[PDB]
Design a protein around this ligand. Structure first.
Ligand SMILES: OC[C@H]1O[C@H](O)[C@@H](O)[C@@H](O)[C@@H]1O
Ligand SMILES: OC[C@H]1O[C@H](O)[C@@H](O)[C@@H](O)[C@@H]1O
Ligand SMILES: OC[C@H]1O[C@H](O)[C@@H](O)[C@@H](O)[C@@H]1O
Lengths: 273, 247, 247, 273, 247, 273
């Protein structure tokens, strides 16, 4: 019955706390019913058949990313008028669209926001949080809590006015651009983080004299490698750890390996700050 | 040392940074905001912000992906600053002690997520009748039970750190081990990077890795400058690459 | 101070830099050539070249576009060096005093252009009969009337600067205002840039703006090096971008 | 009657002082007759109809850029033989071509020579005129008075040998290349000029101690912004002024605003060198 | 000075660096390996490696292309280190004296290649009968005759350098000429570059020349970093450039 | 008769010393027979017609690069079974393929290995051999004697399993990629070598005072050129020498010119370190 404009404003505010009740039986399922409560408020009175829709919102998984869930919310909002006002019969396909947009959007949203957004802003605002005070943990909170809000408001509004017809339309071509541009920024930044923002030092001396009236002209192994490239050892360690992780080893079982190495290597002069 | 009007503030900040552990929107599930917020309430602010900066570099690539629960950087970043800001310790000791806490971490937040099922088995009984208020106060009520299991172990600590039993058992490390963990603190961070690069790895985009690698060795850009050059390069690559031009 | 054999040279250099104000080909309508040429004849050369360098940075984007007359950097760069090279003043004072002269500027060069109509109403009367010499000495004759209105106000000045009436009325600025104009001399230049970027603004080429921005902050290239990297980037972009490859 | 090769050499030398007599009634009109005088010298004797062409050269505007006026000169020179020697009847289309090449060439020439040529050479030779002496105001005069001459000699010669037929040919495709490559160089250079070759400083202190045996460890606001990007404030000022200029405010009414700010800001400690 | 157990080692190292002159596979036909190998056997190693590094910069673009024999950097880099490592001289003197030796060079290695014909006129007489061992010991036997004409002039030298007749005739240079050859040692190297760029010169790839030029003036990359940025740029250019897309 | 796998291992090891007996009558000809000896070992017994193939391996030139000769070796190995086992008649075309792959592979291999491989590794390992000790002449020997071996083993194996049919296939398209990517790396590196790794200095003083309590503020001509670009003079010398070499002047007759200039220029103050 003509979902009011302010009702979309309501679904936006009620979708901020989307992730549940993140269960294991029905992940985010209750969070979807909670996000659609305001729609069902003015869409229906208290009735047997009119209030069985909350049953179908629980009917199965809805396990996608919290941020790419605004297009799905807007599409499923639009589907309700065609079932409430237009009365165009549709029962299974409402969940059909949920399941169909579960798949691609779970794999195109994870390598962006947990991909080149969270650890790129978390890296911009953490090279500053070391030295600085409030330009690190504040360039994060401002710049990341905007990109998540421009993905939710412009998600719901722009996925509500456009029904099914432009789900199959922008589901081809645009997201390939958006995830090929993401994994260029996130690869350019991660190449720099591995190089500069890691510390590895090898104090093994390999050369004597020590000319020029007592300068000792010391040249440890770190100078030999810094003659080639000033970040080589962390680069190789990254490819070792990057190879281990495909074998699904726990990252909490590779960190302990490094904790062992940092003790057994500093007690033999191999590693040392 | 710690006064009763600081315990409550630490408790509330832990509750806020316990809401975010599952909620994953405003990102208090991050060792940056959850660390400055504790540093402000407990005491000096710079020595908490530094912990925050150091702890994210590990906590990149600590995401949840489809019932693969992350090591919970939300509990490992509140106990790990009370044991530095409040009790008389060093940065690298807290960073090293965070890892077992992060292991506590998902063990706790998996039991909580598993026992949350009773909030949906009590949700269908509400959808069968209405109204939706029975749902709008059941979805939130499952959020006041996870924030009370990242904020209670942050009061058991901040009331037991203030004793000689722990404050003297934390000095027989010894000092040889401590300096051996400030050295692993430049190495363990690499794991956090490898998990990220494994997500965004395309064989034809790896040239942009080794390009952002070399330009870091021999140039003095920031990470803002390296994050702007990255987006300029990405936009121009998408602008070229006739895959987006024609058939 | 100023001798009679310097007045004539200043007059001739102003005439040359008054030909260029409309002619716009050899670019004495520029505060660079018109400033070194005055600095050489008046006295020390470096302290005129510095004025020239500083004054262009403002006088970028001071072009004529279709009866939108520019603020006439040809008069604002000759009076503004006689009041520095000849009379005992500072760079930032002249740069600040150039702006009202540039306002004099197009007011003068618009009256001259408007009164030039009599050179065409006397041109058709020549085309109706011939020969073309009646045209080849009417086109040039309209050029000896604009150069005599950027070179006469450059002799009224250079004969009145040499008196105590002006040389003592130019010291009650005071010194607080002077240092407040050497600070605006790093800001007003931005306007000169914005007029240029507004001409060459394409939404898809703005990535090349912020790229040439960041690479300026953290690198020590020249402007020759930044003008060569720019052309290399432009040639390679035109070489790619299959808009120029297919149908 | 077979315009001699030296006659083209003459039109080149007589086209250097093209801009008039830049009137407001007929802009550059007399300058076109003056540039074509040498052609009409040997093309015609003294005659009634033979000397009415100077009337048609005045007949209307010719308001384009001085530098992209060599192709038009060469084309209109070629049109004369077909009206003098070939006698192929054409009266209106001689001005038709002038008007047709007025439009595009006025909008493709202004954003190049007043675009990425005059203020790019004027910027290369003004970062040197500050410190240096004669590599600034001489790298300008040599490098810019060649690019204007290669645009006039190679304009007239190459637009004379090719008549109308290759006006519609090189009027499509080549100039898009030439103005998309121009506004890449001129944007890359203007991004650098806004950053480095501007001075903005904010001496507002925001932090005390001042450890390390009397170093005062002063950290004004300029250090906070230089921690993010060392040219931020002029960049924002550029976007403010870049927004004002679309509203056609006089640039002499934005410079006075800055003169007010530089006095009212240095007298309160906000701005200061 | 030089002992009998160093003559044999110099002879063997010259033989090894004489095999490579035609063989052109393992690259002892290079003034880098052929110089460190002589520096190790003769004496101090750093002062031979420096000669090796300096001598390649000339010996870039010293290739063989289809009966256009190179100036033989294999003889010019063994005599030119015995006259430095063994006999008491400077780097720039040896680098300057290498050029006439390189001229000796292809004159020798052309006579050897020409007289090798007797190894094929004696090869057909073997193919007409077999077995192939008659060929497998004729192909190698033509290799033990070129290595004995880059390793014999490296023993005539290393047994005559140890006398006052040459060691005193090498001091009347004089010292004015010596410092005039350490200056040409920064200029002659350019020839070695021009021969290389002439091979890989495409009119549309010259933008990558002036790009690698400017980035050398104003940046502190290595040659490893400039060799990695180069390959990244090449891979990305091949990835773009729809010449490899379209059909 | 089913050339054993180890026989290919043998041809690889026997092809390392390919270049001859590099004659002038038949360049590399005997080296080809020597590389194919192991094939003819088990392919044939001692016989009149069975042992006339060594005659045809000498029958003409085989003058290509040593490194792009593994594809030809693998193709000609494969041709033998079709003449030995399959007995499919082919006498002239065995040399036909040799001559056909002589041409393109001699011009696509020279501007790579003598192009952007030998003097790129020779430049990486010679900016280090100046200062360092064993990272220059060892980053060369490892990194160049791998690229030549990956070009021979993967050449022979991958050109043996694929007969004629994929000679005309990978002979179009792939090598254009491989030599357009080569001459980008080798141009980027040679632009840097001309700039930094050359020394040219001009001590001609052009300016006096010499303010600031005895600093002498000396500004020779080299400072004027370093104000524009810090490598200009070697860049111009490169274009002069790069122009001379097309005229086939001996490079040993341009080096002597520089030896004359370095003596006549240092004795007049023009050049000087
Ligand atoms: O991809 C599956 C999905 O799993 C969880 O439910 C979410 O928190 C995200 O981490 C992710 O998008
Ligand atoms: O664009 C119109 C035209 O106006 C004036 O006549 C010329 O000086 C140029 O500035 C410009 O090309
Ligand atoms: O290109 C012809 C050929 O000539 C010689 O035989 C070889 O050493 C190579 O230098 C080259 O490939």
């Amino acid at each position: 019955k003509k979902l009011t404009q302010s009702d979309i404003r309501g679904v936006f505010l009620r979708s901020n706390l989307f992730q549940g009740s993140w269960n294991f039986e029905r992940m985010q399922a209750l969070g979807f019913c909670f996000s659609m409560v305001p729609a069902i408020r003015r869409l229906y009175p208290e009735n047997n058949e009119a209030r069985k829709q909350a049953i179908r919102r629980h009917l199965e998984f809805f396990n996608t990313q919290p941020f790419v869930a605004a297009p799905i919310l807007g599409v499923t909002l639009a589907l309700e008028e065609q079932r409430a006002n237009g009365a165009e019969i549709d029962d299974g396909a409402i969940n059909g669209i949920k399941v169909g947009l579960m798949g691609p959007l779970a794999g195109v949203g994870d390598p962006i926001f947990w991909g080149t957004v969270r650890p790129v802003f978390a890296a911009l605002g953490a090279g500053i949080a070391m030295s600085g005070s409030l330009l690190g943990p504040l360039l994060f909170f401002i710049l990341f809590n905007l990109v998540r809000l421009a993905t939710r408001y412009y998600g719901v509004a722009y996925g509500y006015s456009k029904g099914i017809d432009i789900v199959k339309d922008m589901g081809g071509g645009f997201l390939q651009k958006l995830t090929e541009g993401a994994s260029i920024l996130g690869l350019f930044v991660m190449g720099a983080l591995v190089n500069k923002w890691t510390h590895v030092n090898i104090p093994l001396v390999v050369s004597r004299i020590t000319d020029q009236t007592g300068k000792e002209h010391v040249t440890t192994v770190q100078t030999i490698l810094d003659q080639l490239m000033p970040g080589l050892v962390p680069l190789l360690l990254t490819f070792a750890c990057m190879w281990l992780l495909r074998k699904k080893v726990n990252p909490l079982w590779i960190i302990v390996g490094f904790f062992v190495i940092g003790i057994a290597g500093y007690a033999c002069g191999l590693l040392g700050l | 040392e710690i006064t009763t009007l600081q315990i409550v503030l630490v408790f509330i900040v832990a509750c806020i940074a316990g809401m975010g552990s599952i909620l994953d929107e405003f990102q208090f599930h991050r060792p940056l905001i959850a660390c400055t917020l504790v540093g402000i309430v407990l005491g000096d602010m710079k020595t908490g912000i530094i912990i925050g900066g150091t702890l994210e570099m590990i906590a990149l690539g600590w995401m949840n992906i489809g019932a693969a629960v992350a090591p919970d950087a939300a509990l490992a970043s509140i106990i790990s600053t009370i044991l530095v800001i409040a009790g008389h310790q060093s940065i690298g000791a807290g960073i090293a002690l965070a890892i077992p806490l992060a292991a506590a971490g998902q063990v706790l937040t998996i039991i909580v997520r598993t026992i949350t099922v009773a909030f949906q088995h009590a949700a269908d009984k509400a959808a069968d009748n209405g109204n939706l208020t029975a749902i709008s106060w059941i979805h939130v009520s499952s959020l006041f039970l996870q924030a009370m299991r990242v904020a209670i172990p942050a009061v058991i600590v901040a009331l037991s750190v203030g004793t000689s039993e722990v404050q003297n058992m934390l000095n027989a490390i010894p000092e040889v081990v401590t300096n051996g963990l400030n050295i692993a603190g430049g190495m363990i961070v690499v794991v956090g990077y490898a998990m990220v690069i494994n997500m965004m790895r395309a064989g034809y985009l790896m040239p942009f890795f080794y390009l952002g690698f070399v330009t870091a060795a021999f140039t003095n850009f920031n990470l803002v400058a390296l994050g702007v050059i990255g987006t300029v390069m990405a936009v121009l690559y998408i602008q070229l690459s006739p895959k987006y031009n024609r058939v």
